[PDB]
Design a protein around this nucleic acid. Structure first.
Length: 614
RNA sequence: CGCUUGCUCGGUUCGCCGAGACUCCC
DNA sequence: GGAGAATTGGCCA
DNA sequence: TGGCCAATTCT
């Protein structure tokens, strides 16, 4: 079907339609594909299917004991562990009953009665391609290291460079033929069509403590009017809170929400996990997946929130219609005790674009201004005393030339920088704490070396300069970082004749330069750089001690949450200032800089907003 | 115009309330 | 690296 | 007949 896309000028369709067209091409007739694709000639099809997450309410047996789990575990522990050469050997794979047989039979992979082609195909594809993913990730890391080394050499060529003999390692590949058993056994269960979720029905399903609802009946709504709830009962809003309530259509929380009872520095209330769970289980929306003789029941309220906050579905829909906005192939992971759904290809109207550079950035504006004769822009300035600064503009269309209109510049609000700085003080505490804890767990000689190198300061490094008989006089005031004065410092005691020289380069032009060694260059030749043996050890140890931290895992999520909050603010006032729905962001190539740049660049992937890198 | 679970940050009279993220996984 | 669904087929009451 | 849980097949 891809080859004959010629009849359609430029238009690109969705993936499922393309596969169906290929089916209609390989099968009887050829004009069937043309007629099928006729009437659907979108130029910006929906490419993105966001995730939705649900909790697990009940289950027959723990997910580890299911036959599907044991078969997938065997397949994974088998493929993750043969040599890289033999992966292509026994990788017959196939996608059929005949091909899956003679594969599960000639290999020592015991099926536990599981013989479903769909589940087995998912298992085999995911296992083999995760095995390929780890090796291509090793290749990617090696390529990134090579590029970084080349850039480091190029930069070091300009100034006085110490020898840089980076430790040579090729692809990991393990020591023996076995590539790597690095891929952990994924406990997640990948569901398929024949076990797709359905509304819980007491007649055809096991009896559980909670109760179901009529699949066709509209799903229950929340509390209709909280202000009508009487005193002495849950949900009661006291009178001193009624005036200063919210007015925006915010998400409504039940009184048994854990966000209202969680332990907090200033609550002085009593949390009852059992009582809250008992109250919360009564108003669930159960959905059940049956694989073989086993089942798990999930709460569909997460799907309901996903469809509400995105504005795809208004209140009044049913459980059958709510399930119809999601694919019937969720992922059941036992570790979190949740399941992850994914939106259907079309439930979100998002075309994940790619950030544009240079020439293509010119034609992108012509494309957007051709459809509408106004496109809002925002120029993001990440370097300033405020985390984000933006400049707005509205671009018209005039022949081959794009117009412009500077409008205004805003800054991040004062009530948000306060949150960002309350975050910074927490991150610094955790970084210092993990550094100290690593200092505790370093070797005694390594710890002594570390405390010494931290204790060796400018004068400890300049002990050599002192050994040449000089004392700190002229660079003792800020060292004059703009210029180089270490030569004059050594001249103060007649040592400037022993100053070593750094040779500069003319760049594209041919020639070198005889220039006094810079103060920064002098420190470079003087500041010790500790041996990679201990440096790598301490850095790696800090890395895993930081990975295992129970607060670092939370602060890393707060990073992304705050960055996305800033991006959402910038896009909202970008829309409000320009009063245009089409907006394109132009972005210039501890710190919030990296997380903000990733959050801004994620827009072209998650919400289709054209991000221009310049 | 539009919001019942879960999660992050805040206030409190302890009843509840105000903002926030939602591309997830190895 | 992963995160479908239509169309078809053997199928017994 | 019509009903139903599984293989086939596609970018």
């Amino acid at each position: 079907g891809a080859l004959i896309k010629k009849f359609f000028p430029g238009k690109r369709f969705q993936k499922n339609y393309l596969k169906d067209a290929g089916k209609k091409l390989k099968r009887e007739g050829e004009a069937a594909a043309v007629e099928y694709l006729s009437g659907k000639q979108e130029d910006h099809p929906a490419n993105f299917c966001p995730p939705a997450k649900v909790n697990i309410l009940a289950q027959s047996r723990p997910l580890s004991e299911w036959p599907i789990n044991l078969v997938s575990k065997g397949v994974q522990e088998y493929v993750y562990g043969l040599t890289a050469a033999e992966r292509e050997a026994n990788g017959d794979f196939g996608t059929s009953r005949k091909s899956l047989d003679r594969w599960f039979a000639r290999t020592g992979v015991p099926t536990h009665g599981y013989t479903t082609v769909q589940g087995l195909n998912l298992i085999l594809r995911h296992t083999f391609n995760r095995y390929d993913g780890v090796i291509k990730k090793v290749e990617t890391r090696n390529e990134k290291r090579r590029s970084k080394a080349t850039r480091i050499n190029v930069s070091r060529e300009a100034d006085g460079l110490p020898p840089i003999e980076a430790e040579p390692e090729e692809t990991a590949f393990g020591p023996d033929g076995k590539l790597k058993e690095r891929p952990g056994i994924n406990p997640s269960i990948y569901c398929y069509q024949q076990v797709s979720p359905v509304p819980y029905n007491p007649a055809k399903h096991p009896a559980l403590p909670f109760s179901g609802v009529d699949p066709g009946a509209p799903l229950p709504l929340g509390t209709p009017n909280r202000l009508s709830i009487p005193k002495g009962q849950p949900g009661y809003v006291p009178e001193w809170q009624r005036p200063h309530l919210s007015t925006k259509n915010k998400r409504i929380r039940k009184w048994y929400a854990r966000a209202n009872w969680r332990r907090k520095p200033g609550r002085k209330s009593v949390l009852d996990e059992a009582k809250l769970k008992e109250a919360a289980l009564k108003e669930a929306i159960p959905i059940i997946v049956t694989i073989g003789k086993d089942w798990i029941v999930m709460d569909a309220r997460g799907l309901l929130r996903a469809v509400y906050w995105r504005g795809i579905a208004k209140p009044g829909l049913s459980l059958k219609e709510l399930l119809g906005f999601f694919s019937g192939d969720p992922v059941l992971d036992p570790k979190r005790g949740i399941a992850t759904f994914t939106f259907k290809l079309g439930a979100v109207a998002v075309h994940s674009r790619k950030p544009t550079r240079g020439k293509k950035s010119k034609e992108l504006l012509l494309s957007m201004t051709a459809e509408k004769p106004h496109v809002g822009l925002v120029a993001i300035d990440l370097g300033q005393t405020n985390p984000v600064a933006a400049e707005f503009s509205r671009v018209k269309r005039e022949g081959e030339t794009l117009q412009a209109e500077p409008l205004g510049q805003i800054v991040l609000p004062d009530d948000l920088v306060k949150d960002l700085t309350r975050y910074r003080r927490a991150w610094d505490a955790t970084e210092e704490q993990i550094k100290a804890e690593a200092i505790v767990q370093l070797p005694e000689e390594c710890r002594a070396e570390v405390v010494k190198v931290n204790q060796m300061s400018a004068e400890e490094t300049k002990h050599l300069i002192l050994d040449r008989g000089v004392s700190g006089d002229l660079p003792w005031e800020k060292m004059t970082s703009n210029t180089t004065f270490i030569s004059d410092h050594l001249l103060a005691k007649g040592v400037t004749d022993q100053v070593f020289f750094e040779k500069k380069s003319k760049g594209k032009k041919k020639g070198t330069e005889t220039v006094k060694r810079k103060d920064y260059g002098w420190v470079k030749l003087l500041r010790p750089r500790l041996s990679q043996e201990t440096r790598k050890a301490v850095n790696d140890k800090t890395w895993e001690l930081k990975r295992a931290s129970t607060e670092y895992v939370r602060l890393s999520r707060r990073k992304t949450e705050l960055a996305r909050r800033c991006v959402n603010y910038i896009v909202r006032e970008t829309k409000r200032w320009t009063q245009c729905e089409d907006i394109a962001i132009v972005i210039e190539d501890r710190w919030f800089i990296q997380v903000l740049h990733k959050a801004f660049s994620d827009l072209a992937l998650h919400r289709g907003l054209p991000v221009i890198e310049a």
